[PDB]
């Protein structure tokens, strides 16, 4: 009965459509994908060889549309249209962004965690999947070590626990043994007694192991989760969650690497951390909206066959990380980073950016590029979070570059 009931549009927020049903002279109706290729793993698909993926998959209900014994008649009821938050420029400056990489961007509201953009790369186009790595969904359904854009949650902790200050000072040697092992800072650089806000915009993972050390793993977890951690974000949309640890399992020669963002337990439970570039976005957009993480969507509202708005989606909040002071702590900390320390790629002339930065290491001495922020400053309106990945090219800070450049462009577009 199915092909004869005419399925759902898709559209984007500036009403761009993405994907539509059109009748056939047969009565069954063909799914068209207008401007094929544009976030593609968010319009996603349902195909017998490559499975189902994206809005096409997860509104399905909604799409495909809830007597019945004529299938003359199954035409006479339309599938219930869909409207994204995407934004059609938003989408077009990160698809932009990740040409000639592999990584993806995820662009949100902050106060809302609405998803604005929403790009991965290698991506594919609809048109493709009628023949014979571009499928898989790199903002949410890939996971990485976040390496040193996790300091952001260790950070946030020990504050808000009332462990540490900004101008508390720390020991940063290039290398220190903890737990029994060694931590080192990148190049084994000394950076001698600094304040935790420098340390954090150098990134030392001698000083934030330390603040990790004195967190403890589950202070540590618990924060990691109160971001979103173990948590299948999204409203309307799949994520794979982001993974931490048994604090119960964990060592202190662990628990000081998980603090800079690397994994390297061995234990029944997950090594972590382990993240998605989503739940990224989920920690900068807490953090820029003073500690109140919102669960992400993607979907505005649903239309019926004729244009009626049928329902909205409404931001929904999944609790408190840290306080209102906390965060501000935060942001003021990430706003040095991007002023003067290993953010400064980011810097967007005229416009305040604030951000954190991470590299990590991978299989066969590849690595990945991070970054999250948000823009401007003073009353954020956008978070960025980017993952650009080495697969054997040197990609260090090119998430930062990526970062401000999107922030940028999206900030003129909301200005229109
Ligand atoms: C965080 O990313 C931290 N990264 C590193 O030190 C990385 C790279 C350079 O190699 N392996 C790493 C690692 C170590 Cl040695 C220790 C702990 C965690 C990791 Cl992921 C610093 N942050 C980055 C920047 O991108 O923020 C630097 C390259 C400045 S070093």
């Known amino acids: 009965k199915s092909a004869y009931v005419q399925r759902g549009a898709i559209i984007t927020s ?12 047969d009565g069954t109706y063909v799914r068209n994908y207008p401007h094929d290729g544009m976030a593609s793993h968010t319009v996603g698909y349902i195909s017998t060889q490559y ?23 199954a035409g006479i009821t339309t599938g219930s249209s869909v409207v994204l938050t995407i934004n059609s420029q938003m989408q077009a400056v990160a698809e932009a962004a990740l040409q000639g990489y592999s990584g993806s961007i995820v662009v949100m509201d902050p106060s809302t965690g609405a998803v604005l953009a929403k790009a991965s790369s290698p991506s594919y186009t609809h ?12 903002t949410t359904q890939a996971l ?24 508390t000072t720390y020991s940063a040697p290039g290398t220190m043994e903890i737990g029994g092992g060694t931590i080192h800072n990148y ?41 979103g951690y173990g948590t299948a974000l999204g409203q309307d949309f799949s994520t ?23 994994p390297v337990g061995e234990h029944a439970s997950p090594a972590g951390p382990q993240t998605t570039v989503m739940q990224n976005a989920v920690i900068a957009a807490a953090i820029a909206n003073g500690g109140v993480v919102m669960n992400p969507y993607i979907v505005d509202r649903v239309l019926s066959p004729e244009g009626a708005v049928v329902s909205t989606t409404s931001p929904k909040s999944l609790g408190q990380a840290v306080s209102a ?27 305040k950016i604030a951000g954190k930065t991470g590299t990590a290491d991978v299989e066969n001495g ?23 990945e080495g697969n054997g090219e040197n990609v260090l800070g090119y998430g930062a570059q990526v970062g401000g450049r999107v922030l940028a462009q999206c900030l003129n577009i909301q200005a229109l």
Not at 127 to 138: K, Y
Not at 144 to 167: Q, R
């Open 14 to 25: 500036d009403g761009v459509t993405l994907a539509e049903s059109v009748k056939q002279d």
């Open 51 to 73: 499975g189902t993926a994206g809005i096409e998959s997860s509104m399905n209900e909604t799409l495909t549309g809830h007597r019945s014994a004529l299938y003359s008649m």
């Open 127 to 138: 048109a493709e999947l009628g023949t014979i790595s571009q499928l898989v969904d790199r």
């Open 144 to 167: 990485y070590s976040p390496g040193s854009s996790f300091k952001t949650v260790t950070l946030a902790a020990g504050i808000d626990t009332h462990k540490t200050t900004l101008d």
């Open 187 to 227: 190049a084994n650089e000394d950076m001698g007694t600094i304040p935790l806000r420098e340390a954090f915009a150098r990134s030392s993972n001698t000083a934030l192991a330390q603040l990790g050390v004195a967190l403890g793993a589950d202070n540590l977890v618990s924060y990691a989760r109160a971001f």
């Open 240 to 262: 794979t969650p982001s993974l931490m640890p048994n604090p119960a399992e964990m060592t202190t020669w662990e628990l000081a690497w998980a603090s800079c963002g690397l």
């Open 325 to 351: 002071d906390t965060a501000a702590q935060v942001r003021e900390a990430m706003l040095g980073v991007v002023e003067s320390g290993t953010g400064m790629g980011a810097r967007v002339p005229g416009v």
């Open 366 to 388: 590849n690595f990945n590029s991070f970054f999250i922020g948000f823009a401007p400053y003073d009353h954020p309106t956008l978070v960025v979070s980017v993952v650009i």
